[PDB]
């Protein structure tokens, strides 16, 4: 209602198959708008589906009037699956990572180098 969306520095990136822009969000009396709402408003503005819109890096200014962030709209979901980082793709629920620590992978790697042969695969 009172939240409004403007897009400033628009660019059509044919090389990464997207549109990219800076998003100005006006919420004169609220908290900082969640990213799914901004994705829905950009989906209505740019006449597309909201699963190919990725927004990030929102900073609300002092005093609470305006919030600036970055956004991009991909041509398809496949290009979003190609070109987007894995973490921003996982923020939409589209990527899952190994639940393993650095210490675990590093100590397993250093334990496999004391064994030679396919018995390396028997090292936990």
């Amino acid at each position: 209602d009172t939240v409004t969306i403007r897009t400033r520095k628009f660019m059509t990136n044919r090389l990464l198959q997207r549109k990219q822009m800076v998003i100005d969000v006006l919420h004169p009396g609220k908290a900082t708008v969640p990213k799914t709402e901004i994705r829905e408003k950009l989906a209505k503005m740019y006449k597309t589906t909201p699963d190919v819109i990725f927004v990030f890096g929102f900073r609300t200014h002092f005093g609470g009037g305006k919030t600036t962030g970055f956004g991009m709209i991909y041509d398809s979901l496949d290009y979003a699956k190609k070109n987007e980082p894995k973490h921003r793709l996982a923020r939409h629920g589209l990527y899952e990572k190994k639940k393993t620590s650095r210490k675990q992978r590093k100590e397993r790697k250093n334990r496999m180098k004391k064994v030679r042969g396919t018995a390396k695969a028997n090292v936990g």
């Binding site: 004169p28 009396g29 200014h61 002092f62 005093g63 609470g64 009037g65």
Partner: protein, 180 residues
């Protein structure tokens, strides 16, 4: 190797002699007249004025048609006119040597909130700015030392969310009106 910068400067100088009565009295006068927290704010503004006077004397040693004298004197005069300390008709490097600390103190946001009648006193002005009741053209400002430009002189407005401004009342007024 860190991606960090270590550049910073001190914004004041302590006085050379600690206990001189005339300097103490003059500093206390300016503190009381302008509603300042301590002596360090007087020393900060004194440091800014001393740097500007040093730049003016250095540019005054140069000959009149030196390109650096013209460029840097023009920029310094333009800045001093832009913050309202000098008059637009006095754009001449000789008049900078006649500037006083009181002009820089009058261009603060605390002093302008006092002088435009948004506050009943200078200390009321300080506590008003510090409590997010003041905005400058769109932007809520907490800093009493916010130096106001001549283009922002007419846009000191009064915080569209403040109880005395936009209208939504404070903690005490909702707590007290809830009793009855």
């Amino acid at each position: 190797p860190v991606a960090r910068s270590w550049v910073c400067r001190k914004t004041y100088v302590t006085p050379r002699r600690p206990f001189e009565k005339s300097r103490l009295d003059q500093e206390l006068k300016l503190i009381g007249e302008y509603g300042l927290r301590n002596k360090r704010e007087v020393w900060r503004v004194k440091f800014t004025l001393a740097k500007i006077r040093k730049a003016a004397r250095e540019l005054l040693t140069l000959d009149e048609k030196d390109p650096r004298r013209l460029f840097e004197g023009n920029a310094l005069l333009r800045r001093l006119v832009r913050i309202g300390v000098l008059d637009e008709g006095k754009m001449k490097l000789d008049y900078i040597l006649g500037l006083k600390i009181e002009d820089f103190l009058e261009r603060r946001l605390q002093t302008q909130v006092f002088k435009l009648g948004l506050a009943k006193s200078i200390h009321h002005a300080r506590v008003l700015i510090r409590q997010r009741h003041i905005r400058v053209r769109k932007q809520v400002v907490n800093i009493p030392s916010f130096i106001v430009r001549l283009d922002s002189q007419k846009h000191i407005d009064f915080s569209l969310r403040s109880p005395y401004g936009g209208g939504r009342p404070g903690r005490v007024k909702r707590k007290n009106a809830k009793k009855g």
